[PDB]
Each structure stands twice: as structure tokens, then as C-alpha cells.
Amino acid sequence: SPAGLLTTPVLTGAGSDNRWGAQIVALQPVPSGFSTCNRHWNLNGSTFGWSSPRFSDIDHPRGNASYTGGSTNVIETWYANTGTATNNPISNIAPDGFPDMGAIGFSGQTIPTGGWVGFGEVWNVANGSPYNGTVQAYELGFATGAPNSINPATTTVGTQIVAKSIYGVAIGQNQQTAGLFVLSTGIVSTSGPNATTYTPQPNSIVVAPGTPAAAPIGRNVPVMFSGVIRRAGDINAGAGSVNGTQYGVGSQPISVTLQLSLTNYSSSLQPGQFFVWQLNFASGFLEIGLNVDGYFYIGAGASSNMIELTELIDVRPVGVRPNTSTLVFNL
Amino acid sequence: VESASPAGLLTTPVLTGAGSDNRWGAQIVALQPVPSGFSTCNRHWNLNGSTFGWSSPRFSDIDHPRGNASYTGTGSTNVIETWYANTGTATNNPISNIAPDGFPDMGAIGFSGQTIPTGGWVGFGEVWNVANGSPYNGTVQAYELGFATGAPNSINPATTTVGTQIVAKSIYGVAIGQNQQTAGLFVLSTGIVSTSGPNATTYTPQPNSIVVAPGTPAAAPIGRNVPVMFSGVIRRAGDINAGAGSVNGTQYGVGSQPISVTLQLSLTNYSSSLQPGQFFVWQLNFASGFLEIGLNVDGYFYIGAGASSNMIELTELIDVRPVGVRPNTSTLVFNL
């Protein structure tokens, strides 16, 4: 039974989302629909992405590293084609852990807004030793036009994976072949004190061929799981910051992703159905549904206002329902 | 909330590849017996819903709002950056003010003159401006973090939280150093181990370098039953591409608990299902043998390894089956 996939702890503070690993504190309805494949599992034990259901560091053994000038305090760019992560057993699209987001270019000397940023370095393919003057915060994502005219991409087909430092490195490296190493904990790129929109926005997510979309069904709209994430421009901001709170979203709680990767649920739900749970709040309730592609839905209609989980009391299973029956929204 | 049975704390996935340890977050692939015993408090929970440490059962990031930042050098570029504060000043940590949530329970080893220490906890981060939260973006680097005395100019590792400092010191040069009376620290919470050259070092941390808080109970041997840590492969600074089975040697990191156990113990109180003097015991069934593992009320796991400190690989582990409550003086079966 799918019932055990969503339990009260997952949504009352002990859950984490499958993209940022952030503590899940809100639900984010997406009335346009969206797609996600990386670190996303369906109910047939399968993923269309390139990452395992844990938070792997990011390592690629063969890319091009360069900087744009002298050689100190310079922006370092690493890139490779998609489909070259030949040591990744899930997929060669990209290293396990590489973020499913478009890489955004700079605006003059202004840092891009909304990109996935991790800390990392380039390393020497001769011996595995780091080029230690290349440590920095790097924006990672999919793009065309690397190294020096990057535009974000939303497909894995015929594109590049890029890492570009958002600040200057101590000692730049021009290496026609070099490795990448980045930790898998991400922050979002910003400059100045402001939080940006929830990240990634639907049209920023990168998916691989064959990924099914989560489309709305009447008033039933797909939902993402939201937690507070850090941002580069005010790194001390957190939940309730006077400068605004920054949210990151994932398509699934990682505990759900993990369970779906360990057990096949194809006998318990078929196309056209949801497995439904009731979320009971202090003064209302709503139903959340899971479909066979692993996407969650709520009956929010054309609303993208976040639903805070602060007053959630418990989660109770309801059972299998048609996906065309409106999910109750009684808040 | 109370639970009547610890049985659910250890299940087959925890030890056959879906588990992670509570210090490094690494995939659990082995058991590390510790015949002389050890203590751990950070991100370690007991069966009474409590921790003696300063971290939640979660990995996010390390943030401290008020330390001293400095560098040394004749110039301000490509220099070593040091940040430090006293323990007991992490006032924005709801668990404990000892140290920021996520700060590693390891000693900070001093270094200078283009050598770096072996076996320290290293994380990536920066110092930041307390006026507005903006990074000093030229201070990003890999930093060794730990507890110490003597910062900034005579750093020596400490094993207690009492009267010591928390220190971050970059193992490579930063782009632009900062001498600031007050600066904040921001480091990611998943570490690598400091090394030089290609070699792996011993499993990290060794028992003699774990930092604990006052009141932390020790895991002491009881006859042939000895405490065990959970081992996974971790990165190391000197050969960052090395992973499991590397031709240059495999580097292990250890934690006292699978983080899924820590999390469950933090959510549910088990104090009515196990008492001092008792283990809850599970059987680990391998292709070619089996062993018993026990959990005590302080949250520590034990096996009947006796005087052996050999790692036990979990490659051929088939499943985990609950046995029940037993006296901790009964020898745990070890049939490998």
C-alpha cells in the first residue's frame, strides 16, 4: 500500500525535499504544472534522472577549465557536454547530484539571480589533486554557449553542463582537461539582501527525454515541497528574515523518493488514479494526492499561494480515488 | 510520543546501502568495532529523546554570527584565513549554545608554512559581514573546523567543549584576506577529511579526537561486547577524486549512529522499552555467517567482536532481523 509513503513526520518537521534537502515547511501549488526527473522516482521503481535518492557530492572527471582575466581573483568556468558522466551508473547525462537547473549568465558584473550554487573546485586529472586556488562558490546548471556566452537550457539533449564561479578564485586554471568536484548542498544565487522567487521556478527545471509532465486536472494542480534555503547575497538570512525568506522547492520528500526506489508500487496504483491523504490542520484540512508518475497534487485551482505547514496536526490516509475527483481544499 | 519497541530502529535498508552515518552523512558500508570504547554526543540521541550535543538530526549548514576573522601574510591575497569564537556563544542555536548546529565534534589541528594536517574535518565556506549578511566573497575556501585552544596563533586540538574555542582555518589560500573584529562563519555541514598527497588515513575521527560536552556518557566495553561505529567512504582533500576502492586507498569516516536512527530517537521516546543493563538485539544475516548487534539506552551500538578492531564489510549482508531485549552482559554472537 502507498499509504506509508506520506506520514505525519514527513510534513511536520522531519521531512526534507529531494532537490535542496531543506526542511519541508510549506506546500507550493503550481497551477501551470511542471516536470521533474532528477532524484524523482515513480511508482514503478524508476527514475528518468541521473541522481540516486541520496545527496551525493558532484564529481565529473573530464571537462574544460578556463578563466577570463590577470590570473588572480578571476572567474573560473568549467564545462562539459551532457552525456559524458561515464562513471555514473544511473545515467551518463550528468554526474550523480548535478542540479536539474539552467545555468544563468552574468548581468555585467552582477551575479545571476536564481541559479543553483555549490562550493567546489577543479582538480587535476593526472592524480586527483585539487587545483587549490580554484575553490569558490560555483553556479552549476545546464546551458548552451559555454564557457563565455552561457544561456540556460531546460533539456539534457545536446546541451552542456557548466560550473561558473560567482566570485573570483585565488588562482585561475586554464586546463583543456580538468575534473570538477562540488558538494551537493546548494544555495541560490542572489546579490544584495533580497530573497527571490521560490527556486527553481517551473521553467528553470531541466528534464531528460521521456520525463512525464505533471499537468493540472481541473482544480487539481501539482504541488512541490518547500523549505527555507540559503542565498548567496545575504548568507545569514533564514526563516523569517527581515530581508525576506528564501524558499527552495522539490517535487518529492526525499523519504518518499527513497521508498519508491526500494519498492515497486505498480500493483497499488494505475494511471488515472491518485492515492489520497488527508492533512488535518488546527482549523481546516486539505487532501493531497499522489499519481503513478510520483507527482503530488492538491486542489488549489489557480492559486500559487504557499500553504504553511506550521499548524499541521497529522496526516491520515484516505485511499485510491480518480484523479478527476476534486481534492478537498478546506482551509 | 512513546514507542513500545525499538525493533524498528534497525531494518535491512539501513545497513544494505540506504543508511547514512550521523557524522559524515556517508553511505554506511561497514561496521567499525572500537574495543577500547568511545564517546559521542553531537547528533547522537539516546532512548530518552535527548542529546548531549549541539546539532539536530539533519545536515544543513554551519552558521555562527560573531567570531574574529584574520589572516597572515605580507600581502592580503592568497593568504590563510582564520576564524574563531569561544564555545558557548552560539546563541541562535535552540539545541545548545555550545557551538553552531552542524559544527563538527572533532579537534582542530594547527598548521602553518604550506603543510596541512592529516585527519581534520574540512568543509567549504566563507566568512561574512555582520552588518548586512553579505559574504566577504574573497574568503571562500576549504576550512578545517574543530575545537581547540590557542587560537589564532598556537592552535592545538581540544576534546572538550568546556573553556575551548571553535576554529575555522583555511587549508589553502583565500583570494582576499579579511582582518575583522567581528565576522560571521558559514560552512556547509558535510565534510571531507584533510590529507596531503594521495594516501588515505585511518578511519576518521579516531576515538581519541572526538569532542564531547559535559555529562556525555561513554560507550565502554562489557566483556566481549564492544561498541561499534558505522563506516562509510568519505572524500579526502589530497586526492579529491578517490572513492570506494580507489587504487590510492579507501578513506573511511565513522559515526556513532545511522542518521535514520538518530532521527527516530529524536521524535519518539523509548525510555519504557529498554533499561540500563539491557541491549535491544538484532541479528545480521550474511551470505556466509551472522552476527548480533545490540543497542543500549544511551544510543550506542555494540557487537561481540572482543579485542578485534577489524572492519566488518556489509557487502554480503542479506537482512536484519529483530531478536529482542537481552542483558548487556550476555555475549553477542559473532559467527563470521
Going by C-alpha positions, the residue among B329, B333, B334, B105 that lies closest to residue B221 is B329
Number of domains in chain B: 2
CA–CA dist A275, A252 (Å, integer): 14
Residues forming beta bridges with residue B254, ordered by sequence position: B231
Residue showing cell 554526543: B41
Number of residues assigned to chain B:
336
CA–CA dist A320, A72 (Å, integer): 60
| B220 in A contact zone (CB under 8 Å) | no
| A86 in B contact zone (CB under 8 Å) | no
Resolution for this experimental structure (Å)? 1.5
CA–CA dist B152, B175 (Å, integer): 20
CB contact under 8 A, A258 and B18: yes
User: How does DSSP assign A28-50, residue by residue?
Assistant: EE-TT-EE--TT---TTS--SSS
Asked whether residue B172 is domain-assigned, the answer is: yes
Asked whether residue B274 is domain-assigned, the answer is: yes
The three cell numbers locating residue B95: 539545541
CB contact under 8 A, A170 and B77: yes
Asked whether residue B21 is domain-assigned, the answer is: yes
Last residue of a domain, one of B189, B224, B248: B189
Last residue of a domain, one of A156, A184, A212: A184
Q: Are residues B34 and B76 in the same domain?
A: no
Q: Are residues A208 and A246 in the same domain?
A: yes
Q: Which B positions 273-332 lie with beta carbon below 8 A of chain A?
A: none
Nearest chain B residue to A178 by CA: give it: B241
| Chain A residues whose beta carbon lies within 8 Å of the beta carbon of residue B175 | 72-73, 167-170
Last residue of a domain, one of B189, B210, B239: B189
CB contact under 8 A, B174 and A171: no
Neighbours of A311 (CB within 10 A): 12
User: How does DSSP assign B177-198, residue by residue?
Assistant: ---EEEEEEEEES--EE---SS
Asked whether residue B1 is domain-assigned, the answer is: no
CA–CA dist A57, A180 (Å, integer): 10
Residue showing cell 576518521: B204
Q: Are residues B86 and B11 in the same domain?
A: no
Asked whether residue B143 is domain-assigned, the answer is: yes
Three-state SS string over B197-209 comes to CCCCCCCECCHHH
User: How does DSSP assign B134-175, residue by residue?
Assistant: -B-GGG-EEEEEEEEESTTTS-EE-SBSTT-EEEEEESS-BS
Q: Are residues A106 and A129 in the same domain?
A: yes
Neighbours of B240 (CB within 10 A): 25
Q: Is A92 helix (H, G, I), strand (E, B) or coil?
A: coil
Asked whether residue B37 is domain-assigned, the answer is: yes
How was this structure determined? It was done by X-ray
Q: Are residues B143 and B234 in the same domain?
A: no
Phi and psi at residue A28, to the nearest 5°: -115, 100
Phi and psi at residue A296, to the nearest 5°: -100, 150
Those residues whose C-beta lies under 8 Å from the C-beta of residue B234, and which sit 6 or more positions away, are: B24, B26, B191, B192, B193, B204, B251, B252, B253
Contact B160, B83 (CB under 8 A): no
Q: Are residues B264 and B160 in the same domain?
A: no
Nearest chain B residue to A123 by CA: give it: B240
Those residues whose C-beta lies under 8 Å from the C-beta of residue A91, and which sit 6 or more positions away, are: A49, A50, A85, A208
Q: Are residues B134 and B222 in the same domain?
A: no
Nearest to B133 among A55, A181, A235 (CB): A235
Nearest chain A residue to B172 by CA: give it: A132
CA–CA dist B62, B125 (Å, integer): 9
Mark residue B245 as left, alpha or beta (left: phi above 0; alpha: psi -120 to 50; beta: remaining).
Answer: left
First vs last Cα of chain A: how many Å apart? 28
Residues forming beta bridges with residue A175, ordered by sequence position: A65
Cα dihedral sign for B153, B156, B160, B166?
Answer: positive
- Using CA atoms of B145, B146, B152, B155 in order, give the dihedral in degrees to the nearest 10: -130
Going by C-alpha positions, the residue among A135, A77, A186 that lies closest to residue B170 is A135
C-alpha of B196 from chain center: 21
Those residues whose C-beta lies under 8 Å from the C-beta of residue B153, and which sit 6 or more positions away, are: none
CA–CA dist B300, A59 (Å, integer): 34
CA–CA dist A189, A101 (Å, integer): 12
Going by C-alpha positions, the residue among A200, A183, A186, A166 that lies closest to residue A231 is A186
**CATH code for the domain of A319:** 2.40.510.10
Going by C-alpha positions, the residue among B159, B37, B149, B36 that lies closest to residue B105 is B159
Number of residues assigned to chain A:
331
Residue showing cell 542529546: B51
Q: Are residues B246 and B298 in the same domain?
A: yes
Buried b (16+ CB within 10 A) or exposed e, A198-213: bbbbbebbbbbeebbe
Going by C-alpha positions, the residue among B94, B238, B246, B295 that lies closest to residue A181 is B238
Contact A329, A49 (CB under 8 A): no
| Chain A residues whose beta carbon lies within 8 Å of the beta carbon of residue B58 | 16, 23
Residue showing cell 534555503: A229
| A36 in B contact zone (CB under 8 Å) | no
CA diameter of chain B: 65
Nearest chain B residue to A235 by CA: give it: B133
- For residue A13, give the amino acid letter: G
- For residue A170, give the amino acid letter: A
Find the domain containing A29 and state its range.
Answer: 2-50+191-330
CB pairs under 8 A between A and B: 130
User: Which is it for strands B141-149 and B121-128: parallel, antiparallel or unpaired?
Assistant: antiparallel
Residue B278 C-beta-side C-alpha neighbours within 13 Å? 15
| B182 in A contact zone (CB under 8 Å) | no
Strands (E), B210-268: 218-219, 226-233, 252-255
Q: Are residues A209 and A323 in the same domain?
A: yes
Q: Are residues B114 and B143 in the same domain?
A: yes
CB contact under 8 A, A14 and B125: no
Q: Are residues A166 and A215 in the same domain?
A: no
Asked whether residue B89 is domain-assigned, the answer is: yes
| Chain A residues whose beta carbon lies within 8 Å of the beta carbon of residue B171 | 132
Phi and psi at residue B239, to the nearest 5°: -140, 85
CA–CA dist A321, B16 (Å, integer): 35
First vs last Cα of chain B: how many Å apart? 38
Contact B172, B141 (CB under 8 A): yes
Going by C-alpha positions, the residue among A37, A19, A40, A30 that lies closest to residue A210 is A37
Residue showing cell 541479528: B283
Q: Which of A51, A135, A190, A313 has the most B C-beta neighbours within 10 Å, making it the best mutation to test the interface with B?
A: A135
Asked whether residue B127 is domain-assigned, the answer is: yes
Q: Are residues A196 and A171 in the same domain?
A: no
Radius of gyration of chain A (CA): 20
Q: How many Å lie between the alpha carbon of A302 and the closest alpha carbon of chain B?
A: 33
CA–CA dist B15, B30 (Å, integer): 8
